[PDB]
Structure formats: C-alpha cells, structure tokens
UniProtKB/Swiss-Prot annotation, chain B:
Residues 1-129 are periplasmic. The lineage of its organism: Bacteria, Pseudomonadati, Pseudomonadota, Gammaproteobacteria, Enterobacterales. The chain holds residues 47 to 175 of 547 of the full protein. This is Sensor histidine kinase CitA. Signal peptide: none annotated. Disulfide bonds: none annotated. It comes from Klebsiella pneumoniae. Citrate binds at R63, H66, R104, K106.
Length: 124, 129
C-alpha cells in the first residue's frame, strides 16, 4: 500500500544519505562516540523519524536515542543484509522501542569494507 | 489538508534539504566556494535519492551546483528562495524552475554564527509525480 511504501522511501533515503557522510565514516573509524552524537543529534532534530541508530561492523550500538542502549547489540534480527552484503533496504521488526518500519544502509570505508550501519525508523 | 502523495513527497524533499544543508562538509565547501568539492558531496546525495534535482546556491542565490553544469554561475529560478536566504526558514514550495514545474523543499546553509551563506533546494518535477 502507498503509506508504508512512501514512509519507507523517506526512511531509506535518510539511511543511505547519512551513512555516506565523510564525517560519519571517519567518526566510526576512530570510534569517537562524542563526534557521532554531535553529527546525529542534529539529523534527528530535522527528521520526523522516531529514531536513528548507528552500529559498528558487528551490530553493537555506537549511538541510540537512549544512552543506556549504547554498547549493547542492535535488536530485531534484520541487520546482516547490510553488515555482510552491503545492501540498503526497508524492513519491519520489533526493536527496543516497539514495532517499527526502518530503512537501513551500511557505512563503508575507502576500500568498500563495511565498518558500520545506519538504521532510521518509524514506529507503526 | 494536502493530498497523500503531495504531502509524502513534500516531507521527504523538506527533510533532505534540512539534513543536507546542515552537513559540516558542505558548510565548509560553500565557505571556500570550492565548486569541485560541492560536486563531490552532492553527486552521491542525488544518486541515493528519487529527487529530480538538487541545487546549491550561495548567499545571493547564484548557483554553485546544478544538475546541468551550464546553469552554474546563473541565478536560481522560481522567485521562492528569499524566506530561506534572508529569514533562515525551511519550507516546501511549488514553482516553475529551469527544469519545468516542480515541488521543492528548501533550507538555508549557515556558518557557526548563524549567518546564512547559501541554500539547498531538493525538488521533484510535477510531470514525474
Ligand atoms: Na550506505
Ligand atoms: Na538548514
């Protein structure tokens, strides 16, 4: 149906655009959690998304809306297509914040190697 | 009340313009007027979007980047950039640009003092809706 397609498209384009920012690639390479927060807090401000998560190459959270969730594993079971196969896609799963529609895209270094992931989501 | 597709396309156009205009990389490239560096940042942003175009203008609305390189160095078209360039507002608008009628989201680019130094416009031609 049109609604979940249209919202999914908005989520996916944010994930693809944000994950490609040279500043974020570098902050992830350095594991600089404060710099990641400085980059993503404004991106959430300017979006109607419920959340934006950043994970490292193993799907451990580098940034979450709730700081207590940083340093724990991402939830829902739908990150491997981005982390392993470098695909960008829409998915629906139940994370820590409840059931949501999310767009996901890998973060990649200069060689193409996956170093992280961005997930941008809207609760149902 | 706006029709569903009108609203949904406006929302993603507006969010792209707000997000892209706030990227530290683009703020610096605009400050330095480095046209090659602007191109290097915006080309990938367009490749990852269903938008018809993305235009970047300086503080006076002269184009620093356009999908048609022949349009770089000429004034933006439509007459709907002042609220962003002067009042620092972000909004959705409909006007005829060089590419034909389009629905576009606009947002200012600002330096660390809040001063407006440019504009991002992300748009969808009506023909293509
Ligand atoms: Na990506
Ligand atoms: Na802006």
């Amino acid at each position: 149906e049109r609604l979940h397609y249209q919202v999914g498209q908005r989520a996916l384009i944010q994930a693809m655009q944000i994950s490609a920012m040279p500043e974020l690639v570098e902050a992830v390479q350095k594991r600089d959690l404060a710099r990641i927060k400085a980059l993503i807090d404004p991106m959430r401000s300017f979006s109607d998304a419920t959340y934006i998560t950043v994970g490292d190459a193993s799907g451990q959270r580098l940034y979450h809306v709730n700081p207590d969730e940083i340093g724990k594993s991402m939830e829902g079971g739908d990150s491997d297509e981005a982390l392993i196969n470098a695909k960008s896609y829409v998915s629906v799963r139940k994370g820590s914040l409840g059931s949501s529609l999310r767009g996901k895209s890998p973060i990649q270094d200069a060689t193409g190697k996956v170093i992280g992931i961005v997930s941008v989501g809207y609760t149902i």
